[PDB]
Amino acid sequence: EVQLVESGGGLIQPGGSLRLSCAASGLTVSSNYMHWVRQAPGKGLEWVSVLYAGGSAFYADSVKGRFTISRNNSKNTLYLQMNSLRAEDTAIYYCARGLGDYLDSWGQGTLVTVSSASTKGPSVFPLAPSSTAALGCLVKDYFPEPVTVSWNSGALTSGVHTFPAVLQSSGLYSLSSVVTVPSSSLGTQTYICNVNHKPSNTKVDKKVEPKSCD
Amino acid sequence: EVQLVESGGGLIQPGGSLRLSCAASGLTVSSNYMHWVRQAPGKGLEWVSVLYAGGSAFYADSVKGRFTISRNNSKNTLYLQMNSLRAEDTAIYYCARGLGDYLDSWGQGTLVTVSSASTKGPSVFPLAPSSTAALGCLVKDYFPEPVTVSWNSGALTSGVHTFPAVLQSSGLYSLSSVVTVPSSSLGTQTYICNVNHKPSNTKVDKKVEPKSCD
Amino acid sequence: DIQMTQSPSSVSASVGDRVTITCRASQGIGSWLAWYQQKPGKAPQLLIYAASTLQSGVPPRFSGSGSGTDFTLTITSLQPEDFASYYCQQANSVLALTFGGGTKVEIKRTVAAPSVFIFPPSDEQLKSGTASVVCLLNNFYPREAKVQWKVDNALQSGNSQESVTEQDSKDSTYSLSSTLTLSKADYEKHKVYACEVTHQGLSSPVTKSFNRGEC
Amino acid sequence: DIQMTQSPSSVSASVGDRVTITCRASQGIGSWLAWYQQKPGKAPQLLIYAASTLQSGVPPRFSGSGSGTDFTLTITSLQPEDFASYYCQQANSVLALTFGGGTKVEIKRTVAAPSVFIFPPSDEQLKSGTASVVCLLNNFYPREAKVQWKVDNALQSGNSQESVTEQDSKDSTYSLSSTLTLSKADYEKHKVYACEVTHQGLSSPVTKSFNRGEC
Amino acid sequence: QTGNIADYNYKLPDDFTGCVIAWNSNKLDSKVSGNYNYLYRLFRKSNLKPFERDISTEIYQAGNKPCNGVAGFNCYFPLRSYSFRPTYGVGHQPYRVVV
């Protein structure tokens, strides 16, 4: 009976302007408190902004008050504006409500990513098996998160383990994905890895085959 | 030789701002009197505002004076400011001119609608022709107005009768659309009602055939 | 708080018959008077400027004048294109605020028999918990139609809403739809649903009856 | 200057075992306390409202209370669906700003022996001037996966990064892969590349050394 | 306060002192046929300075085309007479007012 939805997120250049939308189902946004929480990858959640009755708002100590809260009671929604974006601002955003310094109901969440650097296409490198066995596709120098790895157009689902993304010293992400395959089907069934994600608009289909020698 | 046109109307959220334009062909806007008349659905013509020579304007007793009249003699136009919307303001606007407490020439009119509530999707239910014959589609729980029935995408235009919308007790509207066809063509010709709603951005196509078990 | 009234609310007349409309004012207004003809789908047009002088582009058959708080308008030779709403606006001497509800006059059509149809609620609508039964009438004159809903041979009051279409430009006829909406519990506890139509063109009332689960 | 840190970093328990997590506040705080279950793929859920009263739609076996600066949380009857991140937010009395690093808990795999595989770098990557060597570990428990590298029978330090996946919903296992990154000139200088894995389920360490691909 | 007559025939300045009086004269300047001696101006370009008298009764210009003194379309005669009858309401009597 109570649900929260978020929209408007997506790719945005640093220093851009964007409007956030969050409508409460069965609740009046002008009465209950509102809370905003962020969670950058690799770290925990962090509160951003809070809403009061009117004419007053408190922000984080680290930030310099770069969010302004505007609320219209006619549409029963909330509006947020972003200014002076930075590389640290890339985090997942959750629409939240609060009461008595406690949080009860949270939305599904929206994603806002600040890309100081340009989008880098993913490089796929085969990982040849050798006699059970495991073969995989190595994804390097790709940016930004997330990326989805599917095999045989989704036909293979058993034993697939997609490793979490890690940050390299060059600022680009790395990811691996493997699967345990019996050695009796190494030469009978071909295996392909599908690497594709939205911000690069590049699809790569790489085939992995066993190597008897070198 | 004398004609009046209106533009700028359309869907608008409550509390928004919209600017009207009314140009007079062969008439100077800074000399003659003006009149704005509002006609609510199911209600008579109601005066809104009148423009004097300059620096003075009178408004309705019920309203608080949320219209500001600004005119420019450079291109012979009229400009209005919109603020503090209300659900009663959903009506037609008639651009009018006055002389001697009398009205002579009125414009064609522009549609201005205020939608405070959410724009929910409709529910089209075909009416089963029981064993000439009558058939149609029942549109219920619809927030936007029925764009068209488009029987067979405009091929069938004879015998169609679109009933006027009525207000339900739940705040929504109810409507029925029917067409009379011969009973010998029930099993040979297939009739489709094209019920679509532009404000909600949906297209619904339904099948009308004699059903079983009423 | 001017508190104007217009009588009668509605009236029907044929071609060449006698018809008139009276506008009454609560307070005393001078000899100034105006009349407007509001045709649906189009902006209304002016009819008169002075108390008795006619406008250049209107026929001179319109007659109407007054001196006191009572005003009237009438037609000497009726025409089929004169059927619209009648509005009165005499004067206010400061801002010209006076307007009434109005009166609509309808074109006469030859009397025939209405086409009565009934439609059971759809199976898709039954899953939503609401059942709607529509009684359909087309191609009938006069506009009046005594549509009575019969549920399990019992009278029903305050349960249905009626909608009347505007008269078509091809045959000047009416279309009436009576929609009965009910919950799923009240729909499943009754077996017989029907609507009875009484009309001038029908010698006897005609009732269309359907039963639940009639396969 | 919040400075809340949750210890220990990670724990491991199964059904019928005893598991607990302790969260401490550097400065004095009231009796207010809250806990959250943060699982990947969806928004986190809450546990309690007050210090001791629980929420309507949470299992009643969650136990946790405190009065001083030391707070703790435990589960009476463990369930497989209660494996997520643990976070604490007691109070701040002005803006409710307190949180810790977090703690993850996983499910045993009867100490299964790891499957240690090696992947020499592909020829396409060698053309770019960078060589990546990945030692693969799968279907293993616990976290004590030594992926210490040997090149030319010599130890290495500070040249590889390890990544651990979340536990699967079917068999609840780990998955670790460590990539050794070196330049093309440094890759061709050496010949033997090896990774040894020491595990509880293995009596002796297993080294998948390679001089060429397999041959 | 503005209106149809306040800013067009006799404007009262803000820094005004004095008094104004009125009385009922419904049985003096009212006839059943109608009185046409009293005339008033209705159409003018803009408001004028207070404390002045206007005598000129030229044709009103309200459109792009000129009328050149010809009473035709889009130009009407700005002077109208006070139509009064002895069978009016409580708000339509001729009142003699001196300032």
Author numbering:
A (entry chain H), B (entry chain D): 1 to 82, 82A, 82B, 82C, 83 to 128, 135 to 217
C (entry chain E), D (entry chain L): 1 to 215
E (entry chain A): 414 to 512
Q: What does the report in the manuscript say about this coordinate set?
A:
Although we used molar excess of YB9-258 Fab at high spike concentration (3.1 mg/ml, 22 µM protomer) during sample preparation, we only observed Omicron BA.1 spikes bound by 1 or 2 Fabs. Analysis of these structures suggests that interactions between “up”–“down” RBDs likely hinder opening of the third RBD contributing to absence of 3:3 protomer:Fab complex in the cryo-EM sample. We noted that similar interactions between “up”–“down” RBDs were observed when Omicron BA.1 spike bound to ACE2. We find that YB9-258 maintains binding to all the tested variant RBDs and RBDs with single mutations. Consistent with the mutagenesis analysis, YB9-258 is able to bind Omicron BA.1 spike or RBD without significant change in affinity and maintains neutralization of Omicron BA.1 virus. YB13-292 showed reduced binding to recent Omicron BA.4/BA.5 spike with L452R, while binding by YB9-258 is not affected by recent Omicron variants.
